[PDB]
């Protein structure tokens, strides 16, 4: 209420939701955690029922549908339900209960038509070309409309120890395949869920200004998926082969350069590791 902070985590068993739960555990912060089997964000009656019981003042919205290629076709309906309907439901619930809403969005809200070396800023106009990115942008607009107190954090290429991601896909494939093909003409930056969870909590702990923030891990140089995969699999007996995006017919028309400018997040005081340092820490944390 006005005197008690009450934290609700949605999508709490995802890779980001789990990371955040563990982070708040470390800091001795209490929360209520829900995922599909406790509060299906597409069911507005269930969302209302949970909010009536919990009365959150702060909601970390980590539920999402993030299968980019499936969202173009076989998962098109579920992508829309979770990322549009679900986003609207959570933003409306937060507005009704007066809760601050931290909404995680994506670098894929941009069209990607930006020269290598240039970066997308929070004030740039979204124009997404993937089903996934379209629905996340609609989720941003719902949050903007219904949650008066909000942080929209656009992140990218998310990986961490507590769910499925590009890193574990690559390692699984390397267990039985000697040659892998990874695009070298799609530019962006990985984001470790631990960095993202820490930034999520840095904004709220320090009551930074509401609005939009870009958060990926950082890079001294250009980064493509190939660069990421090459580093992921450097201890493996697999050849990572750079290809361009026309080498194989892809279902999703992914942005060619969705590298996010990080100046605004840096201006908060938050220190952003490079993705190389983050990946090394991810490997160390996974041993726990």
Ligand X SMILES: O=C(O)Cc1ccc(CO)cc1
Task: Catalog residues that contact ligand X under the rule CB under 6 A.
Answer: 66-69, 106-108, 156-157
Compute the distance between CA of residue 38 and CA of residue 252 in angstroms, rounded to an integer.
31
Applying CB under 6 A, does 7 fall inside the site for ligand NAD?
no
Could you give the CA distance from residue 41 to residue 48 in angstroms, rounded to a whole number?
10
Q: What is the DSSP letter of 245?
A: T
Q: Which is nearer to ligand NAD, 14 or 56 (CB)?
A: 14
- The answer to whether 276 is annotated as binding is no
- State the Cα–Cα distance between residues 188 and 154, nearest whole angstrom: 12
263 is in an annotated binding site: no
Q: How far is CA 70 from CA 28, 87, 90, 101, in A?
A: 38, 19, 23, 27
Residue 135 CA to residue 133 CA, distance in Å, equals: 6
Determine whether 158 is exposed, middle or buried from the number of CB atoms within 10 Å of its CB (0-12, 13-18, 19+). Answer: buried
- The pair phi, psi for residue 83, each rounded to 5°, is -90, -25
Q: Which of 13, 79, 100, 135 binds ligand NAD (CB under 6 A)?
A: 13
**62 is in the binding site of which of ligand NAD, ligand X, none (Cβ under 5 to 8 A by kind)?**
ligand NAD
In angstroms, give the least distance from the CB of 3 to ligand NAD. Answer: 29
- The binder of 68, among ligand NAD, ligand X, none, by C-beta within 5 to 8 A per type, is ligand X
Nearer to ligand X, 51 or 157 (CB): 157
The mark string for 157-186 relative to ligand NAD (x by CB under 6 A, - otherwise) is xx----x-----------------------
Cα 100–Cα 106–Cα 109 angle in degrees, nearest 5 = 115
State how far the Cα of 122 lies from the Cα of 259, in Å rounded to an integer: 12
Catalytic residue among 132, 146, 212, 226: 132
What whole-number distance in Å separates Cα of residue 148 and Cα of residue 159?
A: 30
Annotated catalytic residues are 132
Binding site members:
15-16, 35, 40-41, 64, 104, 136, 158
Binding site for ligand NAD (CB under 6 A): 11, 13-17, 35-36, 40-42, 62-66, 82, 86, 104, 106, 136, 155-158, 163
Binding site members for NAD(+):
15-16, 35, 40-41, 64, 104, 136, 158
């Amino acid at each position: 209420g006005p005197l008690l902070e009450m934290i609700l985590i949605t999508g709490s068993n995802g890779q980001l939701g789990t990371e955040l739960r563990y982070l708040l555990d470390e800091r001795g912060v209490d929360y209520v955690a829900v995922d599909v089997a406790e509060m299906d964000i597409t069911n507005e009656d269930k969302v209302e029922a949970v909010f009536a019981q919990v009365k959150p003042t702060l909601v970390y919205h980590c539920a999402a549908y993030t299968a980019v290629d499936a969202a173009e076709d076989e998962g098109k309906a579920l992508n829309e339900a979770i990322n549009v309907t679900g986003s609207e439901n959570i933003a409306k619930a937060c507005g009704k209960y007066g809760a601050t809403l931290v909404y995680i969005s994506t670098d894929y809200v941009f069209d990607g038509n930006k020269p290598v070396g240039q970066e997308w800023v929070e004030t740039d106009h979204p124009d997404p070309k993937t089903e996934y990115g379209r629905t996340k942008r609609l989720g941003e607009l719902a949050v903007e409309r219904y949650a008066e107190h909000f942080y929209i954090i656009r992140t990218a290429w998310v990986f961490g120890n507590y769910g499925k991601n590009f890193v574990f896909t690559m390692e699984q494939l390397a267990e039985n395949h000697s040659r892998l093909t990874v695009v070298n003409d799609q530019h962006g930056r990985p984001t470790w869920t631990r960095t993202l969870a820490e930034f999520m909590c840095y904004l709220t702990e320090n009551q930074k200004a509401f609005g939009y923030y870009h958060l990926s891990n950082d890079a001294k140089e250009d980064t493509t998926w190939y660069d990421f995969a090459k580093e992921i699999l450097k201890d493996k007996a697999v050849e990572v082969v750079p290809v361009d995006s026309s080498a194989f017919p892809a279902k999703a028309k992914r942005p060619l350069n969705s590298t996010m400018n990080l100046d605004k997040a840096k201006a908060t005081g938050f220190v952003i590791p490079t993705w190389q340092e983050a990946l090394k820490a991810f490997y160390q944390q996974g041993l726990k």
